[PDB]
Design a protein around this ligand. Structure first.
Ligand SMILES: O=C(O)c1cc(SCCc2ccccc2)ccc1NS(=O)(=O)N1CCN(Cc2ccc(F)cc2)CC1
Length: 150
C-alpha cells in the first residue's frame, strides 16, 4: 500500500521530530522529494496550528487522558468515530496531524516515547482508511505540498 507507506513515513517522522527534536537521516524511498516537501510543510504549518489551537488541544488531550500504550490503542476508535463524517479539507488533515504531534509531545513528557510509533501508525491508518478516495481526487501529498506552498 504505497499511499499508506508514504503517509506513515511523513507522519511518523513529523511526530518524532516534534516529540524528541531528533531528525531522521534515513532515506524516504519512492516519491522521496514530495515526502521531504510534505515533512518541510508540516514543520511550518504544524507548529503554527498547535499554537493557534492550543486551548482546544490542551482540552482534547486532557479528555483523552493518555498515560500508556493501552490508552494509545483505544485512540483509533475515537479518531475513526470523529474523522469519518463531515467535509474533508486540507485544513482538517493538517490539524489532525498537528494534534498527533501535540499528543506525541505529551507522550515524551510522561516518558512514554515507545507509544509515539503506535500513535503515528494509528493516525496514518485512520487518514488513509477514511480519506483514500478524497486523497486520490486531491493528488495526495503533491496536493498537500501545493496547497500550503508559500
Ligand atoms: O475535524 C473534526 O471533525 C473535529 C471534531 C472535533 S469534535 C470533538 C472530538 C474529540 C477529539 C479529541 C478528544 C475529545 C473529543 C474536534 C476537532 C476537530 N478537528 S481537529 O482538526 O481539531 N481534529 C483534531 C483531533 N482529531 C482526532 C485525533 C485524536 C488523537 C490523535 F492523536 C490525533 C487526532 C480529529 C481532528
Amino acid at each position: 500500500d504505497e499511499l499508506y507507506r508514504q503517509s506513515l513515513e511523513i507522519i511518523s517522522r513529523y511526530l518524532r521530530e516534534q516529540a524528541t527534536g531528533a531528525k531522521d537521516t534515513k532515506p524516504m524511498g519512492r516519491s522521496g522529494a514530495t515526502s521531504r516537501k510534505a515533512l518541510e510543510t508540516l514543520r511550518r504549518v504544524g507548529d503554527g496550528v498547535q499554537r493557534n489551537h492550543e486551548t482546544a488541544f490542551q482540552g482534547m488531550l486532557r479528555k483523552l487522558d493518555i498515560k500508556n500504550e493501552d490508552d494509545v490503542k483505544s485512540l483509533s476508535r475515537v479518531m475513526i468515530h470523529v474523522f469519518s463524517d463531515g467535509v474533508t479539507n486540507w485544513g482538517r488533515i493538517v490539524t489532525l496531524i498537528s494534534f498527533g504531534a501535540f499528543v506525541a509531545k505529551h507522550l515524551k513528557t510522561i516518558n512514554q516515547e515507545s507509544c509515539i510509533e503506535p500513535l503515528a501508525e494509528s493516525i496514518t491508518d485512520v487518514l488513509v482508511r477514511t480519506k483514500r478516495d478524497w486523497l486520490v481526487k486531491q493528488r495526495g501529498w503533491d496536493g498537500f505540498v501545493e496547497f500550503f506552498h508559500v
